[PDB]
Amino acid sequence: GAMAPSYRVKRMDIAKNDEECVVNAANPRGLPGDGVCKAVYKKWPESFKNSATPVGTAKTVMCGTYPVIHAVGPNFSNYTESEGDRELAAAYREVAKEVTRLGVNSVAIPLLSTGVYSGGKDRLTQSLNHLFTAMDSTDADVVIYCRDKEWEKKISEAIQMRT
Ligand SMILES: c1cnc2[nH]ccc2c1
Ligand SMILES: c1cnc2[nH]ccc2c1
Ligand SMILES: [Cl-]
Ligand SMILES: [Cl-]
Ligand SMILES: [Cl-]
């Protein structure tokens, strides 16, 4: 584990992360997809062999010795707010299990269900709080990757508030 486990946020492509493993914002079918998923497909295409897995689960596939944890958040265009919220919490708990099993000291993670799966709503706080609930009991250094400068400021503030 990390010497002093931390949360950090960076505004850059998760495909260029400096961590020992990556979480993909996957689709259930292991398809190349869009956004984070397409960047992951371009960087680690070997990791999409038998990566298909249901909503609310995570499945790890190695690209060489580099682990890609395919985490399937709910599409809020299909789920109720209540059922979506349950599956989103579950996907992050499955990520925590995988990160623990792999024995990594660090992990790069996007905010699940906040892009094209958001059902047109701002889910920064919802997704981030489920991330914390899952990862708080792990000792890996967590680095959150986002696109938007306003999201970087809000994620940074939320991390600092707990410190
Ligand atoms: C691709 C993905 N995420 C990004 N954040 C800042 C620039 C950039 C490009
Ligand atoms: C957030 C972080 N990294 C990304 N790569 C491609 C899109 C995206 C969004
Ligand atoms: Cl970048
Ligand atoms: Cl998404
Ligand atoms: Cl983002």
UniProtKB/Swiss-Prot annotation:
How does it sit in the bilayer?
Peripheral membrane protein
Binding annotation for ADP-D-ribose: 13, 27, 35, 115-117
| UniProt-annotated location(s) | Host cytoplasmic vesicle membrane
Question: What does the entry's PTM section describe?
Answer: Phosphorylated by host on serines and threonines.
Which segments constitute the Macro domain?
4-163
Q: Which domain of life is it from?
A: Viruses
Query: What does the record's free text say on domains?
Result: In the N-terminus, the macro domain displays a mono-ADP-ribosylhydrolase activity. The central part called, the alphavirus unique domain (AUD) has a zinc-binding function. The C-terminus region, also called hypervariable domain (HVD), is mainly disordered and binds several host proteins. This intrinsically disordered domain contains 2 SH3 domain-binding sites and 2 FGDF motifs necessary and sufficient for the formation of nsP3/G3BP complexes.
Q: How does it assemble?
A: Interacts with mRNA-capping enzyme nsP1. Interacts (via C-terminus) with host G3BP1; this interaction inhibits the formation of host stress granules on viral mRNAs and the nsp3-G3BP1 complexes bind viral RNAs and probably orchestrate the assembly of viral replication complexes. Interacts (via C-terminus) with host G3BP2; this interaction inhibits the formation of host stress granules on viral mRNAs and the nsp3-G3BP2 complexes bind viral RNAs and probably orchestrate the assembly of viral replication complexes. Interacts (via C-terminus) with host NAP1L1.
Task performed by this protein: Seems to be essential for minus-strand RNAs and subgenomic 26S mRNAs synthesis. Displays mono-ADP-ribosylhydrolase activity. ADP-ribosylation is a post-translational modification that controls various processes of the host cell and the virus probably needs to revert it for optimal viral replication. Binds proteins of G3BP family and sequesters them into the viral RNA replication complexes thereby inhibiting the formation of host stress granules on viral mRNAs.
> Would you tell me the protein name for this molecule?
Non-structural protein 3
Q: Which organism is it from?
A: Chikungunya virus (strain S27-African prototype) (CHIKV)
